[PDB]
Paper text:
In this work, we demonstrate that interactions between an aromatic cluster of amino acids in the LpRalF C-terminal capping domain and lipid membranes provides a signal that relieves autoinhibition and converts LpRalF to a highly potent ArfGEF. Auto-inhibition and membrane recruitment are mediated by the same region of the capping domain, thus making both states mutually exclusive and establishing a membrane-driven binary switch. This atypical composition and structure endows it with a dual sensitivity to packing and electrostatic properties of lipid membranes, but not to curvature. Our in vitro analysis predicts that LpRalF uses the membrane sensor encoded in the aromatic cluster to spatially and temporally regulate Arf activation during the course of LCV maturation.
RalF proteins are related to eukaryotic ArfGEFs, from which they depart by a unique auto-inhibitory capping domain that contains localization and functional determinants. One of these effector proteins, RalF, contains a Sec7 homology region, which is the catalytic domain in eukaryotic guanine nucleotide exchange factors (GEFs) that is sufficient to activate Arf by stimulating GDP/GTP exchange.
Residue numbers in the entry: 1 to 347
Write the structure that this text describes.
Amino acid sequence: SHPEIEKAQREIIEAFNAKPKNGINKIKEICEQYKISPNEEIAEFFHQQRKNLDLEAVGDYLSSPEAENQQVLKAFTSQMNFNGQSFVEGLRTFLKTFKLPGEAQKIDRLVQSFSGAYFQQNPDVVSNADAAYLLAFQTIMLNTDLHNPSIPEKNKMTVDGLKRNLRGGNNGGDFDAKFLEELYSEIKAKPFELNFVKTSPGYELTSTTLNKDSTFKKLDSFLHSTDVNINTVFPGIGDNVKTTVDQPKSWLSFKTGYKGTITLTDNKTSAQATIQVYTPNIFSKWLFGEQPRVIIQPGQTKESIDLAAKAAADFSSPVKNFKATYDYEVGDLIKAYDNQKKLITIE
């Protein structure tokens, strides 16, 4: 906590709250001016001014894949005590710290950071860092099973049901039977205090009948497609648009709804946009929302805001929620959406 930053804390708080970018750049400003490291310092301000800062934005800054952001987090998470803490408790504390982003990849980056720190501070508890990430994802999946009011008590995961999934999890080995009993019981008696973001950044398409939507229907078929063009899904975007697809991990669409992320990139303009699909399932419905969601987000580059607007305008269903991105204000996204929704609303 450096004194030049501490002095104008209120100013940095006012800037960050208004627009995170402004505030971050105002932290960097003082850091440059006083020949000091921003990553280690952003992390500190975020910690210190927790009761003051926009926790939605903070969580959103820390969960972003950008190099600077990724470093800030390594520093944020390192500044946490996990020494002495139980795996269940250390994690119980970690998650409690954030206004949890409402998107799988963002959550993953977070869980991945805890894993690396819990293992650093407790090298004896888990065999390696990969083993901590496994245990955490099993713990988070366990948290759903043990507290789902729909699932009958007879179908809710057992203690030995845990030990089974974790045979070969401790760096190609088993974890201590008494530690998993202490894990399972700790999380049986108390569920994780998980506060999520209200509305996630960019365009969010969500309805109880979005599953019925032709564009949504098409986009889903696309996720299990080989060599297909995206203009078949979105004819409002250019012909010249390349796509990459990241399919969901070990924890399937059944335990999140998360059906994956499509990344669209204009091969002439370098405008980028990402589509995220979430379809409610028996396990997910209770924790992650009962209605399908489509989150469209523009890249940092020029015209990315149009690509995103073009994809969202092609949808029949309306965009239920608009939210400012780190580089784009709510209004500009509305401007481009209504514009393409007036443009595409022609033969």
